[PDB]
CSV table of C-alpha atoms in Angstrom, one decimal:
chain,number,residue,atom,x,y,z
A,389,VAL,CA,14.3,1.3,-15.6
A,390,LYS,CA,16.4,4.0,-13.8
A,391,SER,CA,13.3,5.4,-12.2
A,392,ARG,CA,12.4,1.9,-11.0
A,393,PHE,CA,15.9,1.4,-9.6
A,394,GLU,CA,16.0,4.7,-7.8
A,395,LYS,CA,12.5,3.9,-6.4
A,396,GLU,CA,13.8,0.6,-5.0
A,397,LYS,CA,16.9,2.3,-3.6
A,398,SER,CA,14.7,5.0,-2.0
A,399,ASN,CA,12.5,2.3,-0.5
A,400,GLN,CA,15.7,0.7,0.8
A,401,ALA,CA,16.8,4.0,2.4
A,402,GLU,CA,13.4,4.5,4.0
A,403,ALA,CA,13.5,0.9,5.4
A,404,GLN,CA,17.0,1.6,6.8
A,405,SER,CA,15.7,4.8,8.4
A,406,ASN,CA,12.8,2.9,9.9
A,407,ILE,CA,15.2,0.2,11.2
A,408,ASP,CA,17.4,2.9,12.8
A,409,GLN,CA,14.5,4.7,14.4
A,410,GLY,CA,13.1,1.4,15.7
A,411,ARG,CA,16.4,0.3,17.1
A,412,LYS,CA,17.3,3.6,18.8
A,413,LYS,CA,13.7,3.8,20.2
A,414,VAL,CA,13.9,0.3,21.6
A,415,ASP,CA,17.3,0.9,23.1
A,416,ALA,CA,16.1,4.0,24.9
A,417,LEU,CA,13.0,2.1,26.0
A,418,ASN,CA,15.1,-0.8,27.3
A,419,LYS,CA,17.2,1.7,29.2
A,420,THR,CA,14.1,3.2,30.7
A,421,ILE,CA,12.6,-0.2,31.7
A,422,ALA,CA,16.0,-1.3,33.2
A,423,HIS,CA,16.1,2.0,35.2
A,424,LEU,CA,12.5,1.8,36.4
A,425,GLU,CA,12.0,-2.0,37.0
A,426,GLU,CA,14.3,-1.9,40.1
A,427,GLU,CA,13.2,1.6,41.2
A,428,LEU,CA,11.1,0.3,44.1
A,429,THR,CA,10.6,-3.5,43.3
A,430,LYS,CA,14.0,-4.5,44.7
A,431,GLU,CA,13.2,-3.6,48.3
A,432,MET,CA,9.8,-5.4,48.4
A,433,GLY,CA,11.2,-8.4,46.6
A,434,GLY,CA,14.3,-8.8,48.8
A,435,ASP,CA,12.1,-8.3,51.9
A,436,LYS,CA,9.7,-11.0,50.7
B,776,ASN,CA,7.3,-7.2,19.7
B,777,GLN,CA,9.3,-4.1,18.6
B,778,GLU,CA,12.5,-6.3,18.4
B,779,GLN,CA,10.5,-8.8,16.3
B,780,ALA,CA,9.4,-6.0,14.0
B,781,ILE,CA,12.9,-4.8,13.7
B,782,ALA,CA,14.2,-8.3,12.8
B,783,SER,CA,11.5,-8.5,10.1
B,784,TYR,CA,12.5,-5.1,8.8
B,785,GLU,CA,16.1,-6.2,8.6
B,786,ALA,CA,15.2,-9.3,6.7
B,787,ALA,CA,13.1,-7.2,4.3
B,788,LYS,CA,16.0,-4.8,3.9
B,789,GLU,CA,18.5,-7.5,3.0
B,790,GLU,CA,16.1,-9.2,0.5
B,791,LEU,CA,15.2,-5.9,-1.1
B,792,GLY,CA,18.9,-5.1,-1.3
B,793,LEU,CA,19.5,-8.3,-3.2
B,794,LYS,CA,16.6,-7.3,-5.4
B,795,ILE,CA,18.0,-3.8,-6.1
B,796,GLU,CA,21.4,-5.4,-6.8
B,797,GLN,CA,20.0,-7.7,-9.5
B,798,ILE,CA,17.9,-4.9,-10.9
B,799,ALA,CA,21.0,-2.7,-11.3
B,800,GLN,CA,22.9,-5.7,-12.8
B,801,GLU,CA,20.2,-6.2,-15.4
B,802,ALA,CA,19.7,-2.4,-16.0
B,803,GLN,CA,23.2,-1.3,-16.6
B,804,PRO,CA,23.3,-3.2,-20.0
B,805,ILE,CA,20.2,-1.2,-21.0
B,806,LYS,CA,22.2,2.0,-20.5
B,807,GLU,CA,24.9,0.3,-22.5
B,808,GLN,CA,22.8,-0.3,-25.6
B,809,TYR,CA,21.3,3.2,-25.1
B,810,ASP,CA,24.8,4.7,-25.4
B,811,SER,CA,25.7,2.4,-28.3
B,812,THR,CA,22.5,3.5,-30.2
B,813,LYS,CA,23.4,7.1,-29.4
B,814,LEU,CA,26.8,6.8,-31.0
B,815,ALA,CA,25.5,4.9,-34.0
B,816,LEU,CA,22.7,7.4,-34.6
B,817,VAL,CA,25.0,10.5,-34.3
B,818,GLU,CA,27.6,8.9,-36.6
B,819,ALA,CA,24.9,8.0,-39.1
B,820,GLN,CA,23.6,11.6,-39.0
B,821,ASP,CA,27.1,13.0,-39.4
B,822,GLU,CA,27.8,10.7,-42.4
B,823,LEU,CA,24.4,11.5,-43.9
B,824,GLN,CA,24.9,15.3,-43.6
C,349,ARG,CA,16.5,17.2,-15.5
C,350,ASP,CA,17.4,13.7,-14.3
C,351,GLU,CA,18.1,15.1,-10.8
C,352,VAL,CA,14.7,16.9,-10.9
C,353,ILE,CA,13.0,13.7,-11.8
C,354,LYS,CA,14.7,11.9,-9.0
C,355,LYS,CA,13.6,14.7,-6.6
C,356,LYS,CA,10.0,14.3,-7.8
C,357,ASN,CA,10.3,10.6,-7.1
C,358,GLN,CA,11.6,11.7,-3.7
C,359,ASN,CA,8.6,13.9,-3.1
C,360,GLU,CA,6.2,11.2,-4.1
C,361,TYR,CA,7.6,8.4,-1.9
C,362,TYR,CA,7.6,11.0,0.9
C,363,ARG,CA,3.9,11.4,0.1
C,364,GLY,CA,3.5,7.6,0.2
C,365,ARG,CA,5.2,7.7,3.7
C,366,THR,CA,2.8,10.5,4.6
C,367,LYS,CA,-0.2,8.3,3.7
C,368,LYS,CA,1.4,5.4,5.7
C,369,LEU,CA,1.9,7.6,8.7
C,370,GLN,CA,-1.7,8.9,8.4
C,371,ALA,CA,-2.8,5.3,8.5
C,372,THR,CA,-0.7,4.7,11.6
C,373,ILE,CA,-2.2,7.7,13.3
C,374,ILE,CA,-5.7,6.8,12.4
C,375,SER,CA,-4.9,3.4,14.0
C,376,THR,CA,-3.6,5.2,17.1
C,377,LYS,CA,-6.8,7.2,17.3
C,378,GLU,CA,-8.8,4.0,17.2
C,379,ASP,CA,-6.5,2.7,20.0
C,380,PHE,CA,-7.3,5.9,21.9
C,381,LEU,CA,-11.0,5.3,21.4
C,382,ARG,CA,-10.6,1.8,22.8
C,383,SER,CA,-8.7,3.3,25.7
C,384,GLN,CA,-11.7,5.5,26.5
C,385,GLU,CA,-13.9,2.4,26.2
C,386,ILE,CA,-11.7,0.7,28.8
C,387,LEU,CA,-11.9,3.9,30.9
C,388,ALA,CA,-15.7,3.7,30.8
C,389,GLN,CA,-15.8,1.0,33.4
C,390,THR,CA,-14.3,2.6,36.6
C,391,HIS,CA,-12.5,-0.2,38.4
C,392,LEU,CA,-12.5,1.8,41.6
C,393,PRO,CA,-10.3,0.4,44.4
C,394,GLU,CA,-12.3,-0.5,47.5
C,395,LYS,CA,-13.1,2.3,50.0
C,396,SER,CA,-11.6,0.2,52.8
C,397,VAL,CA,-8.2,-1.0,51.9
C,398,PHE,CA,-6.6,0.6,54.9
D,215,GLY,CA,-21.7,4.9,-40.2
D,216,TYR,CA,-21.9,8.7,-40.9
D,217,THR,CA,-19.3,10.6,-42.9
D,218,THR,CA,-20.0,13.8,-41.0
D,219,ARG,CA,-21.9,14.4,-37.8
D,220,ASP,CA,-23.0,17.5,-35.9
D,221,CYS,CA,-20.9,18.6,-33.0
D,222,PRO,CA,-22.8,17.3,-29.9
D,223,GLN,CA,-21.8,20.3,-27.8
D,224,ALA,CA,-23.8,23.6,-28.1
D,225,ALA,CA,-22.7,27.2,-28.9
D,226,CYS,CA,-21.8,25.9,-32.5
D,227,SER,CA,-23.3,24.2,-35.5
D,228,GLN,CA,-21.0,22.2,-37.8
D,229,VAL,CA,-20.1,18.7,-38.8
D,230,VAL,CA,-16.6,17.2,-38.5
D,231,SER,CA,-14.8,14.0,-39.3
D,232,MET,CA,-12.0,11.9,-37.8
D,233,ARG,CA,-9.1,13.8,-39.4
D,234,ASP,CA,-10.2,17.2,-38.1
D,235,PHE,CA,-9.4,16.0,-34.5
D,236,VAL,CA,-5.9,16.8,-33.1
D,237,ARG,CA,-4.3,16.4,-29.7
D,238,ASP,CA,-4.9,19.3,-27.3
D,239,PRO,CA,-2.3,19.5,-24.6
D,240,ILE,CA,-4.4,22.1,-22.7
D,241,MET,CA,-7.0,19.4,-21.8
D,242,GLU,CA,-4.6,17.0,-20.0
D,243,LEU,CA,-2.7,19.9,-18.5
D,244,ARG,CA,-6.0,21.0,-16.9
D,245,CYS,CA,-6.7,17.4,-15.8
D,246,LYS,CA,-3.3,17.0,-14.2
D,247,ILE,CA,-3.4,20.3,-12.4
D,248,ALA,CA,-7.0,19.6,-11.2
D,249,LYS,CA,-6.1,16.1,-9.9
D,250,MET,CA,-2.9,17.4,-8.2
D,251,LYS,CA,-4.8,20.3,-6.5
D,252,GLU,CA,-7.7,18.0,-5.4
D,253,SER,CA,-5.1,15.5,-4.0
D,254,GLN,CA,-3.3,18.3,-2.0
D,255,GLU,CA,-6.5,19.8,-0.7
D,256,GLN,CA,-7.8,16.3,0.4
D,257,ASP,CA,-4.6,15.6,2.1
D,258,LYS,CA,-4.7,19.0,3.9
D,259,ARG,CA,-8.3,18.6,5.1
D,260,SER,CA,-7.7,15.0,6.3
D,261,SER,CA,-4.5,16.0,8.1
D,262,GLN,CA,-6.2,18.9,9.8
D,263,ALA,CA,-9.3,16.8,10.8
D,264,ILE,CA,-7.0,14.2,12.3
D,265,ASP,CA,-5.1,17.0,14.1
D,266,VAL,CA,-8.5,18.0,15.6
D,267,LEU,CA,-8.9,14.6,17.3
């Protein structure tokens, strides 16, 4: 039973690590897309 | 889609945390009777000797 | 001994995560093959845009 | 149906019953080490082959 509990806790820790990796990756990606969306599109769009 | 996956991961994390909580709650008494049997067995062995 | 058993369990769920990441990267290689399949058709821009 | 039967394996000639058999830890020790080594070698070859691609 202790082995099963530590297994479930380890799976929980791995899920938390996956959540942290995904959230930090998506935050960096959102920063990149915010930086690059208006890199050159703003001039053409405002002109149009 | 990454945010959707992260939300699903969070839901799974919370539900599995509830699962581990109930598992610990039911498992601690097992350790309790294990300790009680240990004390009973060692006392019985001492009295026997 | 209990800590060693816990560390064995650590090693083995790390092995499980290794298998999971191997599945992820085989999926990525299939995606790469599909990318080459898309690359097979050229889609060259016309020679007379300008 | 037979009280004593010849040992099926070669390099010997004798008849044994149920009660002569005892557990041999060496056999499952060999089985476990063989399974673990084959698992590690399969993982290594698969990882290297994927690294090739």
